Amino acid sequence: FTPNEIKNKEFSRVKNGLEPTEVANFLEQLSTEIERLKEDKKQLEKVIEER
Amino acid sequence: FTPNEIKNKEFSRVKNGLEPTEVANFLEQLSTEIERLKEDKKQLEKVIEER
């Protein structure tokens, strides 16, 4: 679930489906959250490796 | 982004849009990834606190 995968995530198109841009904007928020949590983990691992 | 916030997010419906179940299933996968990363952080924080 990398940002490039999430940001290039295609879904089947159907009659009466979900608004594509609303979904994309929410997926961007979730990808950003994942990326930030990974950064947070690396910072904690840095604290551990240096102590 | 709690699991229930992600799963309960509503999207408008439009003439031609994204398949709703495909989207729901992908959002569930992203929520799982987020929860796992939060758990990883908590584990690392506990290692640091225990010293």
Side-chain angles (χ1 to χ4, degrees), chain A residues 1-6 8-34 36-41 43-48 50, chain B residues 1-14 16-32 34-45 47-48 50-51:
Chain A
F1 307 108
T2 68
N4 278 328
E5 300 176 272
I6 297 169
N8 285 347
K9 194 34 161 93
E10 305 270 6
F11 299 93
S12 307
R13 302 309 190 95
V14 299
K15 295 183 244 175
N16 202 36
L18 307 184
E19 211 301 301
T21 301
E22 294 174 15
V23 173
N25 291 340
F26 193 55
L27 292 178
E28 178 185 20
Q29 293 179 317
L30 295 181
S31 176
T32 296
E33 178 66 2
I34 289 166
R36 290 172 175 174
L37 291 166
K38 287 172 179 176
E39 290 171 5
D40 293 347
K41 283 176 59 176
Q43 182 51 51
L44 292 166
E45 293 165 357
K46 174 184 208 235
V47 169
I48 289 163
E50 300 186 320
Chain B
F1 298 87
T2 66
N4 283 331
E5 281 166 355
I6 292 171
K7 297 180 202 156
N8 296 347
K9 173 78 181 173
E10 300 209 344
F11 300 100
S12 311
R13 296 294 191 109
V14 291
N16 297 108
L18 309 183
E19 212 300 307
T21 300
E22 292 180 15
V23 173
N25 288 341
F26 191 61
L27 292 176
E28 182 178 28
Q29 292 183 298
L30 295 182
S31 179
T32 295
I34 288 167
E35 293 312 290
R36 286 170 173 183
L37 289 165
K38 289 171 180 171
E39 285 171 15
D40 296 343
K41 285 176 61 174
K42 280 168 234 131
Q43 195 260 351
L44 295 164
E45 288 167 350
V47 167
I48 294 162
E50 299 166 339
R51 294 162 266 100

XYZ file of all heavy atoms in Angstrom, unseen atoms left out:
822
model
N 0.828 -1.196 0.000
C 0.000 0.000 0.000
C 0.865 1.250 0.000
O 0.773 2.080 0.906
C -0.914 0.020 1.225
C -1.724 -1.229 1.394
C -1.435 -2.125 2.408
C -2.779 -1.505 0.541
C -2.180 -3.273 2.564
C -3.528 -2.653 0.693
C -3.229 -3.537 1.705
N 1.705 1.385 -1.016
C 2.547 2.560 -1.124
C 1.728 3.745 -1.622
O 0.635 3.574 -2.171
C 3.689 2.296 -2.099
O 3.165 2.161 -3.426
C 4.445 1.034 -1.721
N 2.230 4.966 -1.433
C 1.508 6.129 -1.967
C 1.245 6.043 -3.460
O 0.152 6.407 -3.908
C 2.419 7.305 -1.586
C 3.107 6.828 -0.351
C 3.380 5.373 -0.608
N 2.207 5.558 -4.247
C 1.995 5.487 -5.689
C 0.881 4.505 -6.039
O 0.071 4.771 -6.935
C 3.302 5.132 -6.401
C 4.198 6.343 -6.609
O 3.716 7.463 -6.784
N 5.509 6.125 -6.582
N 0.813 3.369 -5.338
C -0.292 2.436 -5.552
C -1.622 3.071 -5.164
O -2.594 3.020 -5.926
C -0.083 1.155 -4.741
C 1.173 0.369 -5.061
C 1.348 -0.824 -4.137
O 1.953 -0.661 -3.055
O 0.871 -1.923 -4.489
N -1.688 3.662 -3.968
C -2.948 4.237 -3.500
C -3.372 5.385 -4.405
O -4.553 5.527 -4.747
C -2.821 4.686 -2.030
C -2.535 3.485 -1.124
C -4.089 5.410 -1.574
C -2.125 3.860 0.292
N -2.416 6.222 -4.808
C -2.738 7.386 -5.621
C -3.079 7.016 -7.057
O -3.717 7.813 -7.754
C -1.566 8.363 -5.598
C -1.386 9.065 -4.263
N -2.674 5.832 -7.513
C -3.005 5.345 -8.845
C -4.012 4.206 -8.783
O -4.102 3.400 -9.715
C -1.737 4.919 -9.584
C -0.925 6.106 -10.063
O -1.411 7.238 -10.071
N 0.318 5.858 -10.455
N -4.767 4.126 -7.695
C -5.717 3.047 -7.495
C -6.924 3.270 -8.390
O -7.667 4.242 -8.214
C -6.151 3.038 -6.033
C -6.878 1.790 -5.560
C -6.381 0.533 -6.233
C -6.747 -0.711 -5.454
N -8.028 -1.301 -5.909
N -7.124 2.373 -9.346
C -8.315 2.408 -10.176
C -9.340 1.429 -9.621
O -9.004 0.442 -8.956
C -8.004 2.090 -11.644
C -6.928 2.987 -12.270
C -7.471 4.260 -12.934
O -8.684 4.561 -12.847
O -6.652 4.975 -13.547
N -10.598 1.751 -9.861
C -11.724 0.908 -9.507
C -12.597 0.771 -10.739
O -12.586 1.635 -11.620
C -12.538 1.538 -8.384
C -11.761 1.738 -7.120
C -11.121 2.935 -6.863
C -11.677 0.725 -6.191
C -10.408 3.118 -5.705
C -10.952 0.900 -5.023
C -10.329 2.104 -4.782
N -13.346 -0.326 -10.802
C -14.329 -0.489 -11.861
C -15.316 0.672 -11.836
O -15.675 1.186 -10.774
C -15.104 -1.800 -11.682
O -14.234 -2.908 -11.559
N -15.764 1.079 -13.021
C -16.764 2.130 -13.164
C -18.126 1.488 -13.393
O -18.265 0.585 -14.225
C -16.420 3.073 -14.320
C -15.052 3.746 -14.190
C -14.884 4.403 -12.829
N -13.701 5.257 -12.744
C -13.701 6.569 -12.956
N -14.810 7.197 -13.319
N -12.583 7.257 -12.800
N -19.129 1.965 -12.667
C -20.470 1.405 -12.720
C -21.466 2.547 -12.738
O -21.188 3.657 -12.283
C -20.775 0.476 -11.524
C -19.827 -0.700 -11.518
C -20.709 1.246 -10.198
N -22.646 2.256 -13.261
C -23.740 3.191 -13.114
C -24.080 3.338 -11.637
O -24.082 2.370 -10.874
C -24.936 2.730 -13.944
C -24.617 2.766 -15.422
C -25.790 2.379 -16.285
C -25.505 1.102 -17.046
N -26.685 0.635 -17.823
N -24.280 4.574 -11.228
C -24.678 4.913 -9.874
C -23.599 4.568 -8.842
O -23.904 4.176 -7.717
C -26.031 4.310 -9.496
C -26.677 5.070 -8.367
O -26.554 6.290 -8.294
N -27.345 4.366 -7.470
N -22.337 4.771 -9.199
C -21.234 4.520 -8.297
C -20.849 5.736 -7.476
O -21.478 6.798 -7.527
N -19.771 5.575 -6.712
C -19.293 6.624 -5.831
C -18.562 7.709 -6.615
O -17.840 7.428 -7.581
C -18.322 6.027 -4.807
C -18.816 4.825 -3.994
C -17.762 4.438 -2.957
C -20.161 5.095 -3.325
N -18.737 8.951 -6.175
C -18.098 10.112 -6.787
C -16.576 9.895 -6.836
O -15.934 9.781 -5.774
C -18.431 11.354 -5.959
C -18.521 12.646 -6.742
C -17.247 12.977 -7.473
O -16.201 13.111 -6.819
O -17.287 13.103 -8.708
N -15.968 9.821 -8.029
C -14.548 9.408 -8.074
C -13.591 10.367 -7.393
O -12.603 9.921 -6.785
C -14.266 9.264 -9.579
C -15.601 8.917 -10.151
C -16.587 9.742 -9.365
N -13.853 11.672 -7.473
C -12.932 12.642 -6.889
C -13.025 12.646 -5.365
O -12.000 12.750 -4.679
C -13.184 14.023 -7.494
O -12.988 13.942 -8.910
C -12.225 15.060 -6.917
N -14.237 12.522 -4.813
C -14.373 12.401 -3.358
C -13.590 11.202 -2.836
O -12.893 11.292 -1.812
C -15.838 12.258 -2.942
C -16.731 13.460 -3.192
C -18.204 13.188 -2.872
O -18.497 12.182 -2.189
O -19.063 13.984 -3.313
N -13.681 10.065 -3.527
C -12.934 8.887 -3.098
C -11.437 9.151 -3.197
O -10.678 8.871 -2.264
C -13.365 7.650 -3.902
C -12.471 6.468 -3.578
C -14.814 7.310 -3.598
N -10.982 9.698 -4.321
C -9.557 9.967 -4.480
C -9.044 10.878 -3.374
O -7.937 10.670 -2.855
C -9.303 10.602 -5.841
N -9.805 11.915 -3.011
C -9.334 12.843 -1.986
C -9.206 12.148 -0.639
O -8.273 12.422 0.131
C -10.284 14.029 -1.878
C -10.240 14.928 -3.094
O -9.280 14.916 -3.855
N -11.287 15.721 -3.276
N -10.136 11.250 -0.324
C -10.037 10.501 0.924
C -8.861 9.530 0.894
O -8.129 9.391 1.885
C -11.347 9.772 1.193
C -11.472 9.220 2.582
C -11.320 10.035 3.690
C -11.765 7.884 2.785
C -11.459 9.522 4.966
C -11.922 7.383 4.061
C -11.759 8.193 5.140
N -8.645 8.865 -0.235
C -7.494 7.974 -0.350
C -6.185 8.733 -0.177
O -5.235 8.203 0.413
C -7.510 7.251 -1.694
C -8.640 6.244 -1.873
C -8.551 5.663 -3.271
C -8.585 5.146 -0.831
N -6.112 9.976 -0.669
C -4.914 10.784 -0.462
C -4.679 11.031 1.021
O -3.541 10.946 1.499
C -5.026 12.111 -1.217
C -3.818 13.040 -1.008
C -3.978 14.412 -1.652
O -5.122 14.827 -1.934
O -2.944 15.089 -1.862
N -5.740 11.321 1.776
C -5.598 11.528 3.213
C -5.099 10.268 3.904
O -4.241 10.340 4.789
C -6.914 12.003 3.824
C -7.314 13.401 3.367
C -8.630 13.851 3.943
O -9.592 13.086 3.994
N -8.709 15.118 4.316
N -5.613 9.105 3.505
C -5.199 7.860 4.137
C -3.762 7.515 3.781
O -2.999 7.057 4.638
C -6.152 6.733 3.745
C -7.585 6.901 4.261
C -8.446 5.715 3.841
C -7.656 7.077 5.773
N -3.374 7.719 2.525
C -1.994 7.476 2.131
C -1.048 8.370 2.927
O 0.015 7.924 3.377
C -1.827 7.696 0.631
O -0.464 7.550 0.279
N -1.411 9.642 3.097
C -0.582 10.563 3.868
C -0.442 10.081 5.305
O 0.654 10.117 5.884
C -1.181 11.970 3.798
O -1.134 12.435 2.444
C -0.418 12.932 4.689
N -1.538 9.606 5.895
C -1.481 9.099 7.259
C -0.539 7.908 7.358
O 0.287 7.831 8.280
C -2.884 8.734 7.743
C -2.939 8.146 9.160
C -2.548 9.116 10.261
O -2.250 10.294 9.966
O -2.529 8.693 11.439
N -0.635 6.973 6.406
C 0.261 5.818 6.402
C 1.722 6.265 6.292
O 2.602 5.780 7.022
C -0.150 4.861 5.266
C -1.473 4.171 5.624
C 0.950 3.857 4.959
C -2.158 3.457 4.455
N 2.008 7.185 5.364
C 3.381 7.655 5.186
C 3.912 8.280 6.466
O 5.089 8.100 6.817
C 3.435 8.668 4.045
N 3.077 9.048 7.159
C 3.499 9.720 8.379
C 3.735 8.727 9.508
O 4.683 8.881 10.286
C 2.462 10.768 8.774
C 2.455 11.940 7.826
C 1.307 12.881 8.091
N 1.385 14.059 7.241
C 0.451 14.992 7.190
N -0.627 14.908 7.956
N 0.608 16.031 6.396
N 2.893 7.703 9.614
C 3.114 6.690 10.638
C 4.416 5.942 10.388
O 5.135 5.608 11.337
C 1.927 5.733 10.698
C 0.620 6.322 11.240
C -0.527 5.388 10.937
C 0.695 6.622 12.734
N 4.753 5.691 9.120
C 6.029 5.051 8.805
C 7.204 5.942 9.203
O 8.213 5.460 9.734
C 6.077 4.704 7.319
C 5.183 3.534 6.924
C 5.135 3.365 5.412
C 4.276 2.196 4.981
N 4.205 2.154 3.493
N 7.082 7.253 8.968
C 8.106 8.193 9.427
C 8.228 8.172 10.943
O 9.342 8.191 11.484
C 7.775 9.617 8.967
C 7.911 9.851 7.466
C 7.370 11.208 7.004
O 6.977 12.026 7.860
O 7.337 11.447 5.778
N 7.090 8.148 11.641
C 7.102 8.121 13.100
C 7.829 6.880 13.604
O 8.616 6.952 14.562
C 5.667 8.098 13.640
C 4.877 9.375 13.369
O 5.442 10.420 12.983
O 3.640 9.314 13.554
N 7.583 5.727 12.970
C 8.275 4.504 13.364
C 9.779 4.637 13.182
O 10.557 4.198 14.036
C 7.778 3.337 12.529
C 6.448 2.811 12.947
C 5.978 1.703 12.008
C 6.956 0.533 11.959
N 6.454 -0.612 11.108
N 10.209 5.209 12.056
C 11.640 5.371 11.822
C 12.273 6.270 12.874
O 13.413 6.033 13.292
C 11.888 5.911 10.411
C 11.628 4.903 9.307
N 11.558 7.302 13.322
C 12.086 8.164 14.374
C 12.230 7.402 15.684
O 13.223 7.576 16.403
C 11.180 9.381 14.561
C 11.673 10.375 15.619
C 13.128 10.787 15.420
O 13.527 11.188 14.326
N 13.925 10.690 16.485
N 11.257 6.558 16.018
C 11.350 5.776 17.244
C 12.472 4.752 17.154
O 13.203 4.536 18.130
C 10.011 5.098 17.521
C 8.885 6.072 17.879
C 7.543 5.377 17.796
C 9.098 6.648 19.270
N 12.638 4.124 15.989
C 13.744 3.198 15.796
C 15.082 3.912 15.931
O 16.049 3.334 16.451
C 13.616 2.535 14.425
C 12.405 1.614 14.317
C 12.058 1.249 12.889
O 12.726 1.749 11.963
O 11.109 0.460 12.693
N 15.154 5.172 15.502
C 16.377 5.950 15.665
C 16.680 6.196 17.140
O 17.836 6.090 17.568
C 16.229 7.264 14.900
C 17.357 8.264 15.061
C 17.006 9.540 14.311
C 18.230 10.291 13.825
N 18.221 11.691 14.324
N 15.659 6.526 17.933
C 15.857 6.691 19.372
C 16.424 5.414 19.977
O 17.318 5.454 20.835
C 14.541 7.110 20.055
C 14.662 7.028 21.579
C 14.134 8.519 19.629
N 15.907 4.261 19.545
C 16.331 2.983 20.110
C 17.757 2.658 19.689
O 18.565 2.188 20.499
C 15.339 1.872 19.711
C 14.012 2.065 20.452
C 15.919 0.485 20.006
C 12.840 1.295 19.845
N 18.091 2.896 18.420
C 19.405 2.509 17.921
C 20.516 3.345 18.543
O 21.649 2.867 18.670
C 19.440 2.631 16.397
N 20.222 4.586 18.933
C 21.242 5.464 19.492
C 21.386 5.354 21.004
O 22.432 5.742 21.537
C 20.962 6.927 19.130
C 20.945 7.207 17.639
C 20.814 8.688 17.326
O 20.046 9.382 18.028
O 21.482 9.158 16.381
N 20.376 4.849 21.707
C 20.465 4.689 23.157
C 21.264 3.436 23.489
O 22.481 3.400 23.307
C 19.068 4.601 23.776
N -7.730 8.763 12.110
C -8.601 7.979 11.233
C -8.876 6.637 11.910
O -8.182 5.646 11.662
C -7.927 7.757 9.892
C -7.631 9.015 9.140
C -6.452 9.710 9.359
C -8.522 9.496 8.199
C -6.177 10.875 8.656
C -8.251 10.656 7.493
C -7.080 11.345 7.725
N -9.896 6.590 12.758
C -10.246 5.336 13.399
C -10.844 4.382 12.370
O -11.331 4.811 11.316
C -11.286 5.554 14.495
O -12.509 5.991 13.889
C -10.798 6.559 15.541
N -10.832 3.080 12.653
C -11.464 2.144 11.714
C -12.899 2.499 11.396
O -13.312 2.422 10.234
C -11.342 0.792 12.430
C -10.096 0.940 13.220
C -10.091 2.366 13.712
N -13.679 2.891 12.400
C -15.080 3.169 12.126
C -15.258 4.480 11.367
O -16.161 4.583 10.533
C -15.904 3.079 13.407
C -16.177 1.631 13.810
O -16.247 0.741 12.955
N -16.325 1.389 15.105
N -14.385 5.467 11.580
C -14.452 6.670 10.755
C -14.219 6.331 9.285
O -14.908 6.852 8.398
C -13.425 7.701 11.234
C -13.848 8.493 12.481
C -12.695 9.254 13.124
O -11.543 9.099 12.664
O -12.941 10.010 14.092
N -13.241 5.473 9.012
C -12.927 5.113 7.634
C -14.081 4.350 7.014
O -14.518 4.648 5.898
C -11.622 4.300 7.584
C -10.447 5.195 7.971
C -11.432 3.663 6.201
C -9.144 4.458 8.157
N -14.588 3.347 7.725
C -15.611 2.489 7.147
C -16.952 3.204 7.026
O -17.750 2.859 6.149
C -15.716 1.212 7.978
C -14.428 0.397 7.948
C -14.522 -0.880 8.767
C -13.140 -1.373 9.174
N -13.187 -2.223 10.394
N -17.207 4.206 7.863
C -18.474 4.926 7.864
C -18.463 6.167 6.983
O -19.502 6.822 6.853
C -18.847 5.334 9.290
C -19.096 4.145 10.180
O -19.220 3.016 9.698
N -19.170 4.384 11.489
N -17.323 6.512 6.396
C -17.251 7.662 5.508
C -18.252 7.482 4.377
O -18.325 6.415 3.762
C -15.833 7.759 4.952
C -15.604 8.791 3.878
C -15.488 10.166 4.452
C -15.271 11.199 3.369
N -15.328 12.549 3.976
N -19.033 8.521 4.111
C -20.036 8.497 3.058
C -19.531 9.243 1.830
O -18.801 10.233 1.935
C -21.328 9.150 3.549
C -21.941 8.473 4.764
C -23.452 8.622 4.823
O -23.997 9.486 4.104
O -24.094 7.877 5.593
N -19.931 8.752 0.661
C -19.608 9.378 -0.607
C -20.887 9.586 -1.400
O -21.813 8.767 -1.357
C -18.653 8.503 -1.417
C -17.350 8.236 -0.715
C -17.132 7.037 -0.064
C -16.356 9.189 -0.698
C -15.947 6.798 0.577
C -15.166 8.954 -0.054
C -14.966 7.760 0.583
N -20.926 10.684 -2.147
C -22.065 10.924 -3.014
C -22.087 9.903 -4.145
O -21.064 9.329 -4.528
C -21.946 12.292 -3.687
O -21.642 13.332 -2.782
N -23.281 9.686 -4.687
C -23.492 8.783 -5.807
C -23.706 9.603 -7.066
O -24.402 10.624 -7.040
C -24.733 7.917 -5.581
C -24.617 6.989 -4.406
C -23.552 5.951 -4.660
N -23.593 4.884 -3.666
C -23.988 3.634 -3.894
N -24.394 3.245 -5.101
N -23.972 2.761 -2.897
N -23.141 9.141 -8.176
C -23.198 9.879 -9.430
C -23.466 8.908 -10.566
O -23.366 7.690 -10.413
C -21.909 10.682 -9.701
C -21.794 11.817 -8.707
C -20.666 9.783 -9.667
N -23.766 9.491 -11.732
C -24.208 8.724 -12.888
C -23.278 7.565 -13.194
O -23.731 6.433 -13.418
C -24.296 9.658 -14.088
C -25.250 9.170 -15.114
C -24.526 8.448 -16.212
N -21.983 7.854 -13.306
C -20.954 6.858 -13.569
C -19.881 7.070 -12.510
O -19.196 8.097 -12.500
C -20.370 7.005 -14.974
C -21.404 6.771 -16.065
O -21.838 7.710 -16.734
N -21.817 5.520 -16.235
N -19.757 6.127 -11.602
C -18.792 6.309 -10.545
C -18.106 5.018 -10.206
O -18.166 4.047 -10.952
N -17.433 5.008 -9.065
C -16.629 3.866 -8.666
C -17.493 2.788 -8.020
O -18.440 3.080 -7.279
C -15.559 4.316 -7.668
C -14.701 5.520 -8.084
C -13.648 5.771 -6.997
C -14.047 5.322 -9.451
N -17.160 1.539 -8.307
C -17.851 0.391 -7.728
C -17.810 0.466 -6.197
O -16.710 0.429 -5.609
C -17.168 -0.881 -8.220
C -18.096 -2.057 -8.383
C -18.766 -2.453 -7.093
O -18.057 -2.675 -6.094
O -20.007 -2.558 -7.074
N -18.961 0.574 -5.515
C -18.904 0.856 -4.065
C -18.268 -0.242 -3.234
O -17.597 0.070 -2.242
C -20.371 1.098 -3.691
C -20.984 1.595 -4.960
C -20.323 0.785 -6.044
N -18.462 -1.512 -3.592
C -17.892 -2.586 -2.784
C -16.380 -2.675 -2.966
O -15.651 -2.939 -2.003
C -18.570 -3.918 -3.106
O -19.974 -3.825 -2.833
C -17.991 -5.040 -2.264
N -15.885 -2.458 -4.184
C -14.439 -2.422 -4.382
C -13.810 -1.343 -3.522
O -12.758 -1.558 -2.901
C -14.102 -2.155 -5.848
C -14.462 -3.273 -6.809
C -14.108 -2.949 -8.255
O -13.340 -1.988 -8.503
O -14.614 -3.665 -9.146
N -14.439 -0.169 -3.477
C -13.918 0.916 -2.652
C -13.964 0.535 -1.174
O -12.977 0.699 -0.446
C -14.673 2.228 -2.940
C -14.248 3.324 -1.956
C -14.428 2.687 -4.374
N -15.113 0.028 -0.703
C -15.235 -0.359 0.704
C -14.165 -1.373 1.088
O -13.557 -1.275 2.166
C -16.630 -0.914 0.995
N -13.921 -2.360 0.224
C -12.937 -3.388 0.549
C -11.534 -2.804 0.641
O -10.751 -3.182 1.523
C -12.996 -4.505 -0.492
C -14.253 -5.363 -0.368
O -14.919 -5.369 0.670
N -14.575 -6.092 -1.427
N -11.209 -1.859 -0.242
C -9.888 -1.242 -0.216
C -9.723 -0.362 1.013
O -8.660 -0.364 1.647
C -9.670 -0.431 -1.491
C -8.251 0.030 -1.685
C -7.216 -0.883 -1.808
C -7.954 1.381 -1.757
C -5.912 -0.454 -1.983
C -6.655 1.808 -1.947
C -5.639 0.894 -2.056
N -10.769 0.381 1.382
C -10.707 1.188 2.594
C -10.500 0.315 3.825
O -9.761 0.697 4.742
C -11.982 2.019 2.725
C -12.154 3.130 1.688
C -13.500 3.786 1.911
C -11.032 4.158 1.753
N -11.120 -0.866 3.857
C -10.894 -1.785 4.970
C -9.429 -2.214 5.043
O -8.846 -2.280 6.133
C -11.821 -2.999 4.842
C -11.721 -4.021 5.968
C -12.705 -5.172 5.806
O -13.080 -5.487 4.657
O -13.096 -5.766 6.833
N -8.813 -2.481 3.889
C -7.395 -2.837 3.865
C -6.527 -1.688 4.359
O -5.555 -1.908 5.099
C -6.982 -3.253 2.457
C -7.598 -4.567 1.986
C -7.095 -4.969 0.618
O -7.305 -4.259 -0.369
N -6.418 -6.108 0.551
N -6.842 -0.457 3.952
C -6.050 0.680 4.408
C -6.209 0.896 5.908
O -5.231 1.219 6.599
C -6.418 1.946 3.638
C -6.083 1.904 2.144
C -6.451 3.222 1.480
C -4.619 1.566 1.885
N -7.418 0.706 6.436
C -7.614 0.820 7.879
C -6.770 -0.203 8.630
O -6.141 0.119 9.646
C -9.087 0.657 8.231
O -9.240 0.744 9.634
N -6.748 -1.441 8.149
C -5.917 -2.461 8.776
C -4.450 -2.043 8.781
O -3.757 -2.205 9.789
C -6.130 -3.795 8.057
O -7.478 -4.215 8.269
C -5.192 -4.879 8.580
N -3.956 -1.501 7.663
C -2.566 -1.064 7.602
C -2.297 0.034 8.623
O -1.281 0.000 9.332
C -2.243 -0.564 6.191
C -0.776 -0.232 5.960
N -3.212 1.005 8.723
C -3.075 2.095 9.688
C -3.054 1.547 11.110
O -2.206 1.926 11.926
C -4.195 3.133 9.478
C -3.928 3.910 8.178
C -4.318 4.067 10.679
C -5.097 4.743 7.681
N -3.990 0.654 11.437
C -4.022 0.109 12.793
C -2.741 -0.651 13.115
O -2.229 -0.574 14.237
C -5.250 -0.783 12.967
C -6.578 -0.027 12.924
C -6.574 1.211 13.814
O -6.568 1.038 15.050
O -6.587 2.351 13.285
N -2.220 -1.396 12.146
C -0.989 -2.142 12.382
C 0.188 -1.206 12.628
O 1.024 -1.464 13.504
C -0.738 -3.086 11.211
C -1.685 -4.283 11.235
C -1.611 -5.081 9.960
N -2.391 -6.314 10.059
C -2.466 -7.235 9.110
N -1.835 -7.072 7.954
N -3.186 -8.329 9.318
N 0.260 -0.104 11.878
C 1.334 0.866 12.089
C 1.219 1.530 13.454
O 2.230 1.755 14.128
C 1.348 1.901 10.968
C 1.823 1.339 9.629
C 1.461 2.283 8.498
C 3.321 1.066 9.642
N -0.008 1.834 13.893
C -0.186 2.412 15.225
C 0.263 1.431 16.301
O 0.891 1.822 17.293
C -1.652 2.795 15.431
C -2.129 3.993 14.610
C -3.656 4.138 14.731
C -4.211 5.316 13.951
N -5.713 5.292 13.917
N -0.037 0.143 16.108
C 0.415 -0.882 17.044
C 1.939 -0.975 17.071
O 2.543 -1.118 18.144
C -0.165 -2.231 16.625
C -1.628 -2.444 16.929
C -2.173 -3.718 16.281
O -1.365 -4.583 15.846
O -3.419 -3.853 16.192
N 2.578 -0.921 15.896
C 4.037 -0.949 15.834
C 4.624 0.212 16.624
O 5.597 0.047 17.370
C 4.521 -0.844 14.382
C 4.119 -2.010 13.501
O 3.740 -3.076 14.013
O 4.230 -1.837 12.265
N 4.063 1.412 16.441
C 4.535 2.570 17.200
C 4.402 2.347 18.696
O 5.308 2.686 19.466
C 3.738 3.808 16.810
C 4.117 4.372 15.485
C 3.225 5.540 15.118
C 3.337 6.665 16.131
N 2.584 7.889 15.749
N 3.254 1.828 19.136
C 3.065 1.597 20.564
C 4.102 0.615 21.099
O 4.614 0.785 22.214
C 1.645 1.097 20.830
C 0.582 2.193 20.857
C -0.837 1.609 20.823
C -1.698 2.194 19.695
N -2.401 1.140 18.891
N 4.432 -0.414 20.316
C 5.445 -1.376 20.747
C 6.800 -0.704 20.902
O 7.512 -0.938 21.887
C 5.539 -2.537 19.748
C 6.302 -3.773 20.271
C 7.764 -3.890 19.795
O 8.212 -3.139 18.926
N 8.506 -4.856 20.371
N 7.178 0.133 19.937
C 8.461 0.820 20.010
C 8.496 1.800 21.181
O 9.512 1.907 21.883
C 8.730 1.534 18.685
C 8.916 0.616 17.474
C 8.792 1.391 16.164
C 10.256 -0.103 17.555
N 7.398 2.528 21.405
C 7.336 3.441 22.544
C 7.505 2.685 23.859
O 8.145 3.180 24.798
C 6.007 4.202 22.526
C 5.927 5.259 21.427
C 4.520 5.797 21.196
O 3.549 5.235 21.747
O 4.391 6.794 20.457
N 6.944 1.478 23.948
C 7.083 0.696 25.174
C 8.521 0.236 25.374
O 9.021 0.230 26.503
C 6.125 -0.495 25.155
C 4.665 -0.118 25.321
N 9.205 -0.153 24.294
C 10.618 -0.513 24.408
C 11.416 0.667 24.942
O 12.289 0.508 25.805
C 11.146 -0.998 23.045
C 12.668 -1.081 23.033
C 10.519 -2.335 22.693
N 11.124 1.870 24.448
C 11.830 3.061 24.910
C 11.506 3.344 26.371
O 12.403 3.648 27.174
C 11.497 4.257 23.995
C 12.063 4.007 22.596
C 12.057 5.556 24.577
C 11.461 4.879 21.520
N 10.233 3.236 26.753
C 9.856 3.546 28.129
C 10.476 2.554 29.104
O 10.873 2.930 30.215
C 8.334 3.556 28.269
N 10.579 1.287 28.709
C 11.154 0.292 29.608
C 12.660 0.463 29.744
O 13.238 0.049 30.756
C 10.769 -1.114 29.148
C 9.258 -1.324 29.143
C 8.822 -2.561 28.387
O 9.602 -3.054 27.545
O 7.691 -3.035 28.635
N 13.306 1.076 28.757
C 14.728 1.409 28.837
C 15.597 0.155 28.842
O 15.191 -0.896 29.337
C 15.021 2.260 30.081
C 14.379 3.641 30.056
C 14.322 4.264 31.448
N 13.053 4.003 32.129
C 12.862 3.070 33.062
N 13.856 2.278 33.451
N 11.664 2.925 33.612
